[PDB]
A and B are shown apart, each in its own frame.
Chain A
Amino acid sequence: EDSMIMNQSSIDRGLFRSLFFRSYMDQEKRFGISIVEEFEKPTRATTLRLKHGTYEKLDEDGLIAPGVRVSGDDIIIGKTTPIPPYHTKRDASTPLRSTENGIVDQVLLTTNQEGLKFVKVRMRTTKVPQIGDKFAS
């Protein structure tokens, strides 16, 4: 019924193996004259409603570095937003998609048209053919 048997040794030598890339984008938003979000590694003492994942792969600039393996729900971009009227900020960080893993490949840092900070994190992993994957002549 239209399935197929594949030679496992062929897969081992590299048949139909492929790279997969995903990019995440984030930027700081403006809410007032001097009220801006800020990239940082958020301290648990000063920021409320933190995510459940680990923050231990972020460097001090709020950005993860290339070469580090990441798994689902890990934070890779730390960002906070202040709470209007210490202990004043709220987490606005971006976790890796729960179903994925791989290696951080490259991190772009720049500014956008409005002058605030702007980052992109590209993650790469390798997908190896397995039972259930789809092929066609």
Chain B
Amino acid sequence: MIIPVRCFSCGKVVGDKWDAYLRLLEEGKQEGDALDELKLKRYCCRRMVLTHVDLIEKFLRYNPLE
């Protein structure tokens, strides 16, 4: 829905790295390299950012109910 605050498996904070990850993809870096630059070395942390799906951008389009 929105990027999780913590990695489920190990607990390292990953909720402050989502914006940095999208910017790196505009500059043409590949997904593996972008994660490497952010120092997410264990693959438990990598799944969190690599496989998250950002649905909140879709829910905000529905014109507020007040």
What residues make up the interface of A, taking CB atoms closer than 8 Å to B?
Answer: 7, 9-10, 13-15
Contacts and interface: CB of A to CB of B under 8 A. Distances in A.
Most chain B CB atoms below 10 A, which of A9, A13, A15: A13
Q: Is the interface of A mostly helix, strand, loop or mixed?
A: loop
Interface residues of B, number: 7
B4 A7 contact: no
Contacts of B6: 13-14
Nearest to B4: A14
A13 B48 CA distance: 12
B9 interface: yes
Nearest to A11: B8
Interface of B: 4-9, 11
Contacts of B4: 13-14
A14 B5 CA distance: 9
B10 to A, nearest CB: 9
A10 B7 CA distance: 8
Closest 5 CB pairs of A and B: A15-B8, A13-B6, A10-B8, A13-B8, A14-B4
Given A14-B6, A14-B8, 13 more contacts: A7-B9, A9-B11, A10-B8, A10-B9, A13-B4, A13-B5, A13-B6, A13-B7, A13-B8, A13-B11, A14-B4, A14-B5, A15-B8
